[PDB]
């Protein structure tokens, strides 16, 4: 609860301040992913764009 800001961006820096194999454990825990979803109409617009792509891919069977 005692929240001092400290202006620090030191995740990898706090990992890289010791002896060997601690950086090996820190590399063993490293993904850096899973961003935030977009709002509802933009997610709907993008997946109905994808639906349009697969529907044109479907009727290109009938194209010949």
């Amino acid at each position: 609860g005692a929240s001092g800001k400290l202006s620090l961006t030191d995740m990898m820096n706090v990992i890289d301040d010791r002896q060997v194999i601690e950086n090996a454990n820190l590399l063993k825990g490293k993904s850096s992913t899973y961003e935030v979803p977009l709002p509802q109409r933009i997610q709907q617009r993008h997946d109905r764009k994808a639906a349009y792509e697969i529907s044109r891919q479907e009727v290109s069977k009938w194209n010949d």
Binding site: D47, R48, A51, Y52, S55, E58, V59, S60, W62
Partner: protein
């Protein structure tokens, strides 16, 4: 179609699915004649929408300059349709490239109230808001003749 398009089957009293873009009414619909799981519709936002029941979702939407009255698919191309709207010319769209109406049949004087393809796949019947019907061929773009 109504306030928004609904999809029923005859084993339920309630609508199975609801498939609009936004809260906008839909004047007419039509299914295919083959590749049956997709369909098209027209709403009074002057808009043509397509839908695909395999993805169970709308899929594309164009907006013309006047309201489309009646759409009709081709029973031999399966990806072409005609579109009859209040400006006095029945457009003829290709589905998988909806940027260009690949034909426009341009002989009436009033609103183009309905169109349909013949099942031979090349003649268009149309019937206008003015007291006349016309028959077109697909490959020309003007009127063959008139009743």
């Amino acid at each position: 179609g109504g306030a928004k398009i609904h999809l029923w089957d005859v084993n339920r009293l309630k609508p199975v699915s609801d498939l609009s873009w936004g809260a906008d009414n839909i004047t007419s619909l039509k299914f295919n004649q083959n590749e049956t799981d997709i369909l098209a519709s027209t709403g009074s936002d002057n808009s043509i929408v397509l839908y695909d029941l395999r993805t169970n979702s709308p899929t594309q939407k164009i907006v013309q300059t006047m309201r489309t009255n009646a759409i009709c698919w081709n029973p031999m191309e399966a990806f072409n349709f005609v579109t009859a709207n209040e400006d006095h010319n029945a457009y003829y769209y290709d589905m998988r490239n909806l940027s260009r109406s690949l034909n426009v049949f341009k002989d009436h004087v009033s609103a183009v109230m309905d169109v349909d393809f013949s099942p031979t796949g090349d003649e268009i019947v149309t019937g206008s808001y003015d007291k006349s019907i016309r028959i077109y061929k697909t490959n020309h773009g003007h009127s063959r003749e008139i009743y």
